[PDB]
Amino acid sequence: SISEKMVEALNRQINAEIYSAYLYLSMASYFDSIGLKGFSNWMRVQWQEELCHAMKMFDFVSERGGRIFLQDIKKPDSEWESPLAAFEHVYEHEVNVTKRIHELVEMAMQEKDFATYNFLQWYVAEQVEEEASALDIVEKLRLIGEDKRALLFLDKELSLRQF
């Protein structure tokens, strides 16, 4: 019953959400390279959490009787200017994923692929948090600015991120 088109559309978003994780992981290697262990953890946990959103979506596609192919994965950025510049790339990148989702939500309703539509809600519900929690840090990394005292303070705060 699921459409040929939809399975294709979804297959790009599985293979995109895997790219998200591979990116954040690179950011962990960057935050590992400038001594920030909490930021490393936050990303290390982000890398895991994104992986599971693709796997939730992988499973769904297999449940509805669609076949999942996996295409190659691009080289993520290995370098940034500073912590603030990394989180500006995060915020921007999740906002692009936010719209990439809203498109599937539209495709699902145009086809009346209801089962899919309800399933995607979880990602419409999720992204609000990923956007807002990115921005919360982006605003703060500006407000803190060049002071290292407060940067290491926020470093420890993000070390306690789990799941």
In angstroms, the Cα distances linking 129 to 35, 67, 136 are 27, 30, 10
Long-range contacts at 103-109 (CB < 8 A, ≥ 24 apart) = 103/9, 104/9, 104/10, 104/13, 107/5, 107/6, 107/9, 108/6
DSSP 14-28: HHHHHHHHHHHHHHH
Q: Does 85 interact with a second copy (rule: CB under 8 A)?
A: no
Query: CA neighbours within 13 Å on the CB side: how many for 107?
Result: 17
Residues 41 to 70 in contact with a second copy, rule: CB under 8 A: 44, 55, 58, 62-65, 67-70
78, 85, 92, 96: which one binds a second copy (CB under 8 A) = 78
Q: Does 86 interact with a second copy (rule: CB under 8 A)?
A: no
Q: Does 92 interact with a second copy (rule: CB under 8 A)?
A: no
- Interacting residues with a second copy (CB under 8 A): 1-2, 22, 25-26, 28-29, 32-37, 44, 55, 58, 62-65, 67-76, 78, 95, 98, 102, 105-106, 109, 112-115, 117-119, 121, 124-125, 127-129, 131-132, 135-136, 139-140, 143-145, 147-150, 152-157
